[PDB]
Design a binder for this molecule. Sequence first.
Ligand SMILES: O=c1ccn([C@@H]2O[C@H](COP(=O)(O)OP(=O)(O)O)[C@@H](O)[C@H]2O)c(=O)[nH]1
Ligand SMILES: [Cl-]
Ligand SMILES: [Mn+2]
Ligand SMILES: [Mn+2]
Length: 553
Amino acid sequence: SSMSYSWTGALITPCGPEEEKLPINPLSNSLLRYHNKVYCTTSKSASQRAKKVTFDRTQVLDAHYDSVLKDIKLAASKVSARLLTLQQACQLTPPHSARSKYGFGAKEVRSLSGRAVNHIKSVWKDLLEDPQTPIPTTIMAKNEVFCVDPAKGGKKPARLIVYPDLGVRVCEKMALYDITQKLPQAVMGASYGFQYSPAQRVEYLLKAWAEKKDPMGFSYDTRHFDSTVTERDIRTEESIYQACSLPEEARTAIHSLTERLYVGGPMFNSKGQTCGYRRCRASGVLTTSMGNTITCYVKALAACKAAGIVAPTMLVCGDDLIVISESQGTEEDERNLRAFTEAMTRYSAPPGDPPRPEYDLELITSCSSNVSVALGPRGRRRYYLTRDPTTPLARAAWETVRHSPINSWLGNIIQYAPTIWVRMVLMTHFFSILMVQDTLDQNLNFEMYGSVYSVNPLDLPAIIERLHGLDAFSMHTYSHHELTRVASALRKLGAPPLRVWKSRARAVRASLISRGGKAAVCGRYLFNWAVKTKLKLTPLPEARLLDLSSWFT
RNA sequence: ACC
Ligand SMILES: O=c1ccn([C@@H]2O[C@H](COP(=O)(O)OP(=O)(O)O)[C@@H](O)[C@H]2O)c(=O)[nH]1
Ligand SMILES: [Cl-]
Ligand SMILES: [Mn+2]
Ligand SMILES: [Mn+2]
């Protein structure tokens, strides 16, 4: 039995000055009017979060768990992984990664400066030689943007981010980067959710649904997952990494990282003051995503067995889970789900919201998204991935000296291209703004899973065809759920309604077309929905030539 | 902060 955290009373402090909202939002004040509703989480609310994630865990495992873990270790044993060289690990450091306390930053790391390389040499040697001394961490509040929600308390408190010095972060990669690239896929196979594009995720869920004689589905998410992860879960994570075939030196670093960093340690705020002690997942270590996903998978698969879920097909992404299985009748389904939740709760993975069984695929939300349905160019049902557009619209209106929301618009257009809210609202706004700026042909960054991809706005039609298919330009007759949710979100943020967007889009389309070239292709393909007499849209040659593999894997 |  253990407390997730203990605290000294020292504040969780900010890094520098927190971003200020301005009196005019010139890029987004034609998108929506209720800018008062759009806020960024700050260190100010960090103490409120701290309180909500500090609690006593008392975990109890059973034979279901023991049996699943056994099978996972076995599957792990088929993996061979290597150390990264110090230098390879250095080059995987993101360009703005928070600098070391020891006199260098990401720039020096990525260029293999001598002082940075030498410091990292001594960090690595010290990991091989001291398997015990706790490694210090910094605790920080995440800054992210949401729309106020009266129901859910108004403003969400900032999540807590916990990470070690840059020098240690490089070492983590040396020991574990290769494992992060191989282990989840080896132990989960098709259940590993991170490997799928939106269309592929959709295809997978539909496939799973059609395979059952009488399907039932549900989603699950753990409340404050990192805080629920126990010291023992983390040692079990090690035992799973150690089941791979590894060179001896990696075994030793992995063990030291586990005991000195991953299982816990002292936390300092940005001012250097002792803040607390952690006995749970540090979100910010290399193993955050792999560890979350695997430990979620272990618990959830064991809980399925404990609950009597028949013929489970799982999709797991971090602490986000969908299970599609054979219905045993709604009465047993409901009982089985309570047993599932009970087992997860024993396993120290308690729910934010209790799960419930569903028998219609539209009604299952996971990873903030859900499958919906519309009609394609030949009048066939077409399934696609959508989500509540509230957060995307709020982020679309985050505009400060330090931050442009244009990249946000782009990321949503790519990921959610077939949706009614992207097609009618975000595409219309994006193209209008860039045209008026005369920056249509300037490349933008599309950010995904921490990676960044340079995209030209005028290549979107090819990109969208490749990622979502040509159907993405002719979806119509969207679902009641989706029409309702979109209209409501637009009202809530003070944006024009869909019919006004349709009028704006007509004019955006005509302006694009009038420019000829790739712009006119954007107009014809991306806004064929806006005109009375549809055009016949044919496969784009450039789309065949595209390889977008890495974007969603 | 990590993916
Ligand atoms: O910016 C983020 C968001 C989430 N997570 C990790 O993913 C887990 C699940 O996140 P979720 O969105 O379900 O929120 P939580 O379960 O933390 O309340 C977290 O506990 C973190 O370990 C993270 O590392 N960074
Ligand atoms: Cl069709
Ligand atoms: Mn969660
Ligand atoms: Mn989650």
